[PDB]
Amino acid sequence: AISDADLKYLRRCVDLAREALDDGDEPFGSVLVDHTGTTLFEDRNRDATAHPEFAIARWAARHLTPDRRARATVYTSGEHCPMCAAAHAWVGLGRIVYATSSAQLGGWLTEWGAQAPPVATLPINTVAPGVVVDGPAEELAETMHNLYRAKFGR
């Protein structure tokens, strides 16, 4: 179950990835949602550690209680890299939903002959065993493929 409600928040992550692409950044966006369904924070890509998932981790730590964090959900256009996955787990954030996996992205970068990142594309549960993780979203594969192609294709 990627629910219909989840898809609504993933589509929004996708629009943030587009917004970042248009302002000259890498196409990645994420959205922190509280247990209620209220969007608490939103971000997108922008130094090389400026990942929206990490920004969300630092934000959740600064502005939420351990208890509220644990009940929050993070949606993301692209599965967290190991930095973000670890940060999320260290601050005690809850569920993660992603539209594309770092497996799909790594496959695609290889297809385009693009430089592999200096960080391995580990699935989240390899880095953070306790986190509940849903995705990818079959509905948004082609869109993300196209978005990633705009930035990284070659």
Ligand X SMILES: Nc1nc(N)nc(O)n1
- Which residues contact ligand X by CB under 6 A? 26, 28, 45, 51, 78, 81, 117
The item of Zn ion, ligand X, its own copies, none sharing an interface with residue 89, based on CB under 5 to 8 Å by kind, is: its own copies
Q: Is 51 annotated as a binding residue?
A: yes
Tell me how far, at minimum, the Cβ of 76 lies from its own copies, in Å: 16
Long-range (24+ apart) CB contacts under 8 A made by 108-113 are 108/145, 108/148, 108/149, 108/152, 109/148, 109/152, 112/149, 112/152, 112/153, 112/154, 113/154
- Do 44 and 16 form a contact (C-beta atoms < 8 A)? yes
Quick note: the x/- pattern for its own copies over 98-117, rule CB under 8 A, is: -------------------x
Told to check if 81 binds Zn ion by CB under 5 A, we report yes
HSE (side-chain half, CA atoms, 13 Å) at 135: 30
Tell me how far, at minimum, the Cβ of 8 lies from its own copies, in Å: 28
Q: Report the 10 Å Cβ neighbour count for 110.
A: 10
Please identify, using beta-carbon distances, which residue of 17 and 64 lies nearer to ligand X. Answer: 17
Rg, the chain, Cα only: 14
Tell me how far, at minimum, the Cβ of 143 lies from ligand X, in Å: 17
Told to check if 17 binds Zn ion by CB under 5 A, we report no
